[PDB]
Design an enzyme around this catalytic site. Structure first.
Site, PDB file in Angstrom:
ATOM      1  N   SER C   1       0.846  -1.225   0.000  1.00  0.00           N
ATOM      2  CA  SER C   1       0.000   0.000   0.000  1.00  0.00           C
ATOM      3  C   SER C   1       0.865   1.253   0.000  1.00  0.00           C
ATOM      4  CB  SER C   1      -0.905   0.022   1.240  1.00  0.00           C
ATOM      5  OG  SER C   1      -1.668  -1.167   1.354  1.00  0.00           O
ATOM      6  N   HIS C  23      -2.808  -1.871  -1.152  1.00  0.00           N
ATOM      7  CA  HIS C  23      -2.414  -3.013  -1.970  1.00  0.00           C
ATOM      8  C   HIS C  23      -2.876  -4.265  -1.242  1.00  0.00           C
ATOM      9  CE1 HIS C  23       1.109  -0.485  -3.780  1.00  0.00           C
ATOM     10  NE2 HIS C  23      -0.042  -0.245  -4.383  1.00  0.00           N
ATOM     11  N   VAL C  70      -0.435  -0.974   5.908  1.00  0.00           N
ATOM     12  CA  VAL C  70      -0.046  -1.910   6.949  1.00  0.00           C
ATOM     13  C   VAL C  70       1.272  -1.504   7.597  1.00  0.00           C
ATOM     14  CG1 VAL C  70       0.961  -4.201   7.289  1.00  0.00           C
ATOM     15  CG2 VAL C  70      -1.265  -3.963   6.167  1.00  0.00           C
ATOM     16  N   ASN C 244       4.665   1.039   3.498  1.00  0.00           N
ATOM     17  CA  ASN C 244       4.905  -0.177   4.277  1.00  0.00           C
ATOM     18  C   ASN C 244       6.292  -0.255   4.894  1.00  0.00           C
ATOM     19  OD1 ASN C 244       3.062  -1.630   1.659  1.00  0.00           O
ATOM     20  ND2 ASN C 244       2.272  -1.336   3.742  1.00  0.00           N
ATOM     21  N   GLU C 455      -2.533  -2.810  -7.035  1.00  0.00           N
ATOM     22  CA  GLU C 455      -3.483  -1.720  -7.146  1.00  0.00           C
ATOM     23  C   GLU C 455      -4.904  -2.278  -7.059  1.00  0.00           C
ATOM     24  OE1 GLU C 455      -2.113   1.701  -7.741  1.00  0.00           O
ATOM     25  OE2 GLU C 455      -0.538   0.355  -6.982  1.00  0.00           O
TER      26      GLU C 455
END
Lengths: 153, 522, 522, 153
Positions: C1, C23, C70, C244, C455
């Site tokens: 992400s 993501h 995350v 991330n 994506e």
């Protein structure tokens, strides 16, 4: 596969293009060198004559102080004299080419005295030995051994 | 100077390619190149050579061609003499100088002359000189007994076969230069040429400084034959090259290493970024055409930017000064090419001048040092990003002082001006990575700089049948007062618009503008 | 992400910009994102959220918006129990397990069910499990007493001011995630959110493996409050981001360092090349517009190529195998972008799979290791060019086996196929440097691969008045059997043609295709 | 500078665009959540119902072996029960929103029984607690604590 046909000049002539590039055609080697000398004199005569003057060890004599360091450098290194020595050691055929080249420079100055810078006229006439002298100075005492590296400047 | 020779296998049409690309001062008289064509019933030669020289050094014809680059062959030794008792100390004993009284005239301002005495002394080494600091030095020059330099070049550029070329080159009458060769039969050759004295000890650096002049232990007498010098012929890589870098990567893969020769023949210093580009431009490209070969010659990559910007930019971005941040963003957006429209180039050079010295050859600022094991990808990184950022701060100031702004178009400041022709410049310093070279001068009061040295005679030849060649002479073919052939090629240079070199009779006849019939009355 | 928040000062119009870019798997059901718009007299929220969730996690409206990535907050501890005398050894003594007999039904193939007993045991740590290898493990999960996760997100994405947002975020009911915020008044914020237990010793790695379950010395009880976690608000750099990577470069320049927090909150491992691109894409660009902001999101640079090809290519070129040389020349000509027409991309990934492991995260092959001091320019170089060349030899083989040739167009093998829509792919693996991610699957028998993850919901918002936003949902907004809204957006994705997200009444009315009046009979 | 005017719904309705994106307008919060639940059921009803089934700890009961590991994981971790506990601890207003959302899912299935996958009908009706259960499983027992990290798989 063979190269195209080599041209074979029937007369001595220089064909110049629009950029001042000389195409020298000679019936023999000496003629070609003569034409090359003429061409060079016409395109860079002033500086060539001055350079030949310096290679004689006469830069200081002809032009003064600004050329004295080079004169001392070439004289101390025996350049002018070794040039005479190297000239005498040339093969007959190559000496003829060197002489023709020199004659070419002289002929041009002879035919166009108003195009030779005034302060450089005193160098005329040049000789085959002057041609050797300049090449010797350029190779050994400018490229290989420079006054700066010896003098430590 | 640059030099490329491409074997048939690496080309599209199967004909060897040759690049003549000497770099020399644009003003020094004896460094002025002249373009000419000589045709005789027995030979033909086209090319450039220094004025005053009766033979063409950068020559080519329907069959072969050569090119040269400086290799700095150490053919001379400067010895520190120990003066004693009217002579010099040699092997514990005092020897007498060979003394000769000479005289020379010195022109005065008014045109008259005065006689000045000149004593010429020689030690067993050679002529003796005295530096400003008082050091007594004797210079020993190798090859003073090689009278055939001009004829060797004549026989080389006029050889009917590679064997004749080599036999001529083997005479050892040309005291220096890297010489590259290519012919229509497909042979390409690179030679680290010159007259190098055989020495029993000492590396190149030792023989480049003042050598002790008090011992016969350092008095060399013999010189190396051709087969002792680095040479490459039709290597596996299909090309040969040299951009003034030591002879350790004349081709890729290499065909020898430093240990294969005396440590005094050539230096083992870091290869310039331009020399690295040379190796990459050749090795990374295949199926070359003359057109592609010519396009590669125009390479003007700011290679040092690739090795430094990744580290410099982030470090500069943290500086609180919005100008430093602005310069970092300007440098980051740059495509790293020395193009006329580059707005970041000038600033980068100024930073590089500090990071790598005024001549951009400094190595101390890099994070990863140069290594022969990675000859085209090192040095790399910025060792001290923080210090490098301070250098950038100063560079920003220097860029403004010199050019007026931190983002002036490269080509607006970099100009090629000859007589009344004024055109935009492109490409630049070789030590920054630019293959095509234009050693720009310091700017004038308005930020305008011009080439001091760089591209002069540029020619590319394909040895097809008949041959096809293109070239350009930066400063024209004449420098006589009032000539129209001084500034008539620079505009073409600015657009990389090369002229076809005419060797064939019909081509020349179609182009004739002046005819000079002549009679050589021996 | 990915996640970007841009302060007004760094934009052209003076309005904060926000990027929602999670993501996730394209197939895992509970990871499916759904796009929706909720309007009430008291609030409005637009955005995506995982199916089944009653609140929008990636939300924005006329005033503010947030996004998540995350961060892997270690909110759970797995303890190795030492079983003894019917209990477990704890502080030298044997404790009894809390034991509860349960039962559950298991559907059979024929549709009937059978009852299966299930004993549920707990140590002082938490529920007890047994691994296949026999290890007895107890899992302790933090925040089991935080019932307000859904309402906290509701109050966050519906906050009338930044202070309300923070107060809500401060409840500590959302156990994990990096959360980025931006609003129309100009505030941008990054928060390393989650419920982290306070520990008296041990770094993150210690608390990620099996912790000793035989001592109260490791039994944590309290958890960290918001002000103890890494946070950034309106930093000097004008932006906040997270891809991330550990929270050590959420902005540039940084506003804190690892030593400012307990060593167990987050890892201090090398930042991925995608995370490095994230920092560069933001810090190196100024005067951003929404259009420029959106173009930067499409970044798909093979960053690892920039860090390795300079060393790899020369080394490969010396190999005698003409295929290796051909692959080296192919890689050298490549612009290092993961574009549909790239003929070198596939080969490069295959080499990278060996050089940096199957997930491209390996560091052992680099010459210069990663360093927080140069967070966006390290690691770098190839440590063992020779070994790397062998890896390339093998990669050439793997590329041919998988795709049929060493130079198949990236977009011919990389395809996005949903129902009957089949379109060319672009961009790729984040660990290779691609910012826009498409974690391509292994190819089928014909060399065709499709996205497994990457994506999904992509949106860019400018908090102007009214706000302007654009977005796309890779796999449509519906996954029910036979729906027409599963594969109806992928073609747009392949052309990066984002739809304008409609929040204003008149816009929605102009776009209505179906109307569902409803009566909520409480 | 002030935000544009906030729209104020006068009736409960969902306006869908050409991509299947729902624009839910409610006269109050519960209505909005109800519409959101309805919309979600229509767009992803099958998987949502299945997921809610798993969060009840009844994945094994409803669908068999392939869902048994998750059932053991959620039951042993007391997820279904804690969901009930968390549901009871919700604020009155938010419980109403959760209930409305659940009612939305049920209403859709009630109005379109032929669009609900057969093997998932047994999950109906869902409750506000199921909504909480799923969120609790996703957050704490999928993202924070995964069965793989505990089981060591």
């Amino acid at each position: 596969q063979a190269p195209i046909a080599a041209y074979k000049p029937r007369s001595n002539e220089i064909l110049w293009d629009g950029y001042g590039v000389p195409h020298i055609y000679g019936v023999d080697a000496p003629s070609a060198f003569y034409g090359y000398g003429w061409a060079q004199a016409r395109s860079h005569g002033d500086n060539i004559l001055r350079l030949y003057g310096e290679a004689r060890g006469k830069g200081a004599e002809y032009w003064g102080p600004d050329y004295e360091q080079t004169t001392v450098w070439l004289l101390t290194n025996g350049v002018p004299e070794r040039a005479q020595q190297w000239y005498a050691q040339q093969s007959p055929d190559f000496r003829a080419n060197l002489d023709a080249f020199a004659a070419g420079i002289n002929a041009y100055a002879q035919q166009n005295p108003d195009d030779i810078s005034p302060e450089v006229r005193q160098v005329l006439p040049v000789s085959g030995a002057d041609v050797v002298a300049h090449a010797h100075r350029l190779m050994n005492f400018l490229y290989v051994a420079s006054p700066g590296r010896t003098l430590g400047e | 100077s640059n030099s490329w020779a491409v074997a048939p296998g690496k080309t599209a049409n199967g004909n060897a390619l040759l690049l003549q690309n000497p770099h020399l001062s644009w003003t020094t008289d004896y460094f002025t190149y002249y373009e000419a064509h000589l045709v005789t019933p027995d030979f033909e030669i086209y090319g450039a050579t220094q004025i005053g020289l009766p033979v063409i050094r950068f020559a080519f014809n329907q069959r072969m061609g050569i090119t040269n680059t400086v290799n700095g062959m150490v053919g001379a030794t400067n010895y520190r003499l120990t003066l004693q008792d009217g002579g010099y100390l040699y092997d514990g004993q005092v020897r007498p100088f060979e003394r000769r009284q000479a005289s020379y005239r010195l022109r005065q301002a008014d045109g008259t002359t005065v006689d000045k005495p000149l004593e010429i002394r020689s030690s067993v080494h050679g002529p003796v000189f005295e530096r400003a600091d008082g050091t007594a030095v004797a210079v020993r020059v190798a090859g003073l007994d090689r009278p055939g330099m001009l004829e060797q070049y004549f026989d080389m550029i006029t050889a009917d076969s590679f064997d004749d070329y080599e036999a001529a080159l083997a005479r050892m009458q040309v005291p220096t230069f890297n010489i590259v060769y290519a012919d229509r039969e497909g042979t390409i050759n690179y030679s680290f040429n010159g007259v190098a004295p055989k020495r029993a000890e000492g590396d190149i650096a030792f023989w480049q400084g003042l050598v002790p002049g008090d011992s016969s232990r350092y008095l060399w007498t013999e010189t190396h034959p051709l087969d002792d010098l680095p040479r490459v012929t039709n290597p596996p890589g299909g090309f040969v090259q040299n951009s003034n870098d030591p002879p350790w990567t004349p081709t890729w893969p290499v065909t020898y290493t430093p240990k294969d020769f005396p440590s005094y023949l050539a230096p083992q210093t870091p290869h310039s970024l331009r020399a690295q580009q040379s190796v990459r431009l050749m090795s990374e490209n295949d199926d070359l055409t003359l057109e592609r070969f010519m396009a590669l010659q125009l390479s003007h990559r700011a290679v040092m930017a690739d090795r430094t910007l990744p580290d410099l930019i982030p470090a500069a971005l943290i500086d609180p000064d919005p100008e430093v941040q602005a310069a970092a963003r300007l440098l980051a957006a740059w495509d790293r090419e020395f193009t006329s429209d580059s707005r970041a180039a000038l600033l980068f050079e100024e930073w590089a001048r500090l990071f790598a010295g005024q001549n951009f050859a400094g190595q101390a600022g890099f994070a990863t040092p140069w290594s022969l094991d990675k000859p085209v990808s090192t040095p790399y990184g910025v060792r001290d990003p923080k210090a490098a950022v301070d250098q950038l701060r100063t560079a920003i100031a220097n860029t403004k002082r010199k050019y007026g702004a931190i983002d002036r178009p490269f080509g607006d400041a970099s100009r090629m001006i000859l007589n009344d022709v004024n055109v935009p410049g492109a490409a630049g310093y070789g030590n920054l990575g630019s293959f095509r070279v234009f050693t720009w001068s310091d700017p004038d009061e308005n930020g305008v700089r011009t080439p001091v040295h760089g591209e002069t005679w540029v020619a590319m030849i394909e040895f097809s049948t008949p041959v096809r060649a293109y070239g350009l002479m930066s400063y024209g073919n004449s420098r006589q007062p009032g000539t129209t052939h001084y500034s008539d090629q620079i505009e073409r240079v600015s657009r990389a618009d090369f002229r076809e070199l005419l060797l064939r009779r019909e081509q020349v006849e179609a182009a004739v503008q002046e005819r000079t019939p002549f009679n050589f009355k021996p």
